[PDB]
Amino acid sequence: ECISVKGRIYSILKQIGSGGSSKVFQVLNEKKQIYAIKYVNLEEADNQTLDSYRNEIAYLNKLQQHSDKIIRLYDYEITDQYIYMVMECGNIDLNSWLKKKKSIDPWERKSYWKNMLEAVHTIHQHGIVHSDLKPANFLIVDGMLKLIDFGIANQMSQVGTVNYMPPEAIKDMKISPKSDVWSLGCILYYMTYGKTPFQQIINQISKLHAIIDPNHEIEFPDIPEKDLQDVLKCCLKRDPKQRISIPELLAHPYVQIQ
Ligand SMILES: Clc1ccc2c(NCC3CC3)ncnc2c1
């Protein structure tokens, strides 16, 4: 089984990415170099959907040259019927790795955090707020985290967590770069304490109520890394104005010292 993209033939090893109008394949070029090919079927896509797809592709292509913490787009083919994207394969996505992980090495966690800040800072610098950050949006490649997507794509049953959702998004029923800081904060909180801040709340309506409720205090059990603890408290402030920024996070002792 094979796919051609801009003349070049790729043999398929397996399917990574599953279901929807979109599939991801692990593939090899004729020199046996490994890649991921993202395949999108465009037959049922309206113009607004199409426009979001072209817009994410254009941004991914542009911002590549600005950080190596953003996934590599090598090439693509795009017609009225389909998109093929030839991309960096990597080793494993962050969520699948975290699921099979007993505990995280403090050094690795700090390193992943640095990568995540770098990727997200980069998109913010070009006017993009992701607004839907989770572990699955990060790919581990040679012990480096890379951002897989920018959250621009429009649309593609018991999945789609609200665990990383910021309070101002829920009260808004504005989104800003601080919204990404919250979700990053929930990812780091999960890498620190083994769960996300509101993961205990069974009912989703209740969960959303806890997220926005000032009287609902998030717990920050004492840990050896006091700087890590402070990062979490700064990221998980409900008021976006008082929430720490990415530039402030990049100067934080947690990422700078030792
Ligand atoms: Cl676009 C893209 C590229 C690679 C992905 C990936 N790679 C890890 C799979 C073991 C090969 N895992 C999950 N999603 C991916 C998405």
**Amino acid identity, position 80:** D
Q: How far apart are CA 18 and CA 41, in angstroms?
A: 13
On the 0-12 / 13-18 / 19+ scale of CB atoms within 10 A, 16 is middle
Residues 39/18, Cβ–Cβ less than 8 Å: no
Please give the distance, rounded to the nearest whole angstrom, from the Cα atom of residue 71 to the centre of ligand 1. Answer: 10
Query: In degrees rounded to 5, what are phi and psi of residue 214?
Result: -60, -35
Q: How far apart are CA 59 and CA 10, in angstroms?
A: 25
Residue pointed to by tokens 């593939």: 27
User: What is the DSSP secondary structure assignment for residue 236, as one 8-state letter?
Assistant: T
Count the Cβ atoms, other than its own, within 10 Å of residue 130.
22
Within a 13 Å sphere around the CA of 90, how many CA atoms are in the beta-carbon half?
Answer: 27
Query: In degrees rounded to 5, what are phi and psi of residue 177?
Result: -55, -25
Q: How far apart are CA 76 and CA 172, in angstroms?
A: 37
Q: How far apart are CA 23 and CA 41, in angstroms?
A: 9
Candidate list 68, 75, 132, 227, residue with the active-site label = 132
DSSP for 22-53, please give it.
EEEEEEE-TT--EEEEEEEE-TT--HHHHHHH
Q: How far apart are CA 123 and CA 151, in angstroms?
A: 11
Please give the distance, rounded to the nearest whole angstrom, from the Cα atom of residue 133 to the centre of ligand 1. Answer: 16
Residue pointed to by tokens 């989104």: 175
Stated resolution in angstroms:
2.3
Contacts of 170 (CB under 8 A, 6+ apart): 208, 211, 212
Residues at the annotated binding site for ATP? 16-24, 38
Pocket of ligand 1 (CB under 6 A): 16-17, 24, 26, 36, 38, 87, 89-90, 92-93, 139, 148
Across the chain, the runs of DSSP E, i.e. the strands, are 2-5, 8-17, 22-28, 34-41, 73-78, 82-87, 92-93, 138-141, 144-147
Atom of ligand 1 nearest to the CA of 71: 1
Torsion-angle region of 231 (φ positive above 0: left; ψ -120 to 50: alpha; else: beta): alpha
On the 0-12 / 13-18 / 19+ scale of CB atoms within 10 A, 256 is exposed
On the 0-12 / 13-18 / 19+ scale of CB atoms within 10 A, 131 is middle
**Amino acid identity, position 138:** F
What strands, in cross-sheet order, belong to the sheet with 8-17?
2-5, 8-17, 22-28, 34-41, 82-87, 73-78
Angle at 222 between CA 218 and CA 223, to 5 degrees: 120
Residue pointed to by tokens 């904060």: 185
Residue pointed to by tokens 């800003």: 176
DSSP for 93-115, please give it.
EHHHHHHT-SS--HHHHHHHHHH
For residue 241, which of 170, 176, 184 has the smallest C-alpha distance?
176
Tokens of 29: 């070029």
Residues 243/234, Cβ–Cβ less than 8 Å: yes
Q: Return the axis-axis angle of helices 226-235 and 177-193, rounded to nearest 10°.
A: 140
142 catalytic residue (yes or no): no
Structural domains in the chain plus CATH codes: 3-91 (3.30.200.20), 92-258 (1.10.510.10)
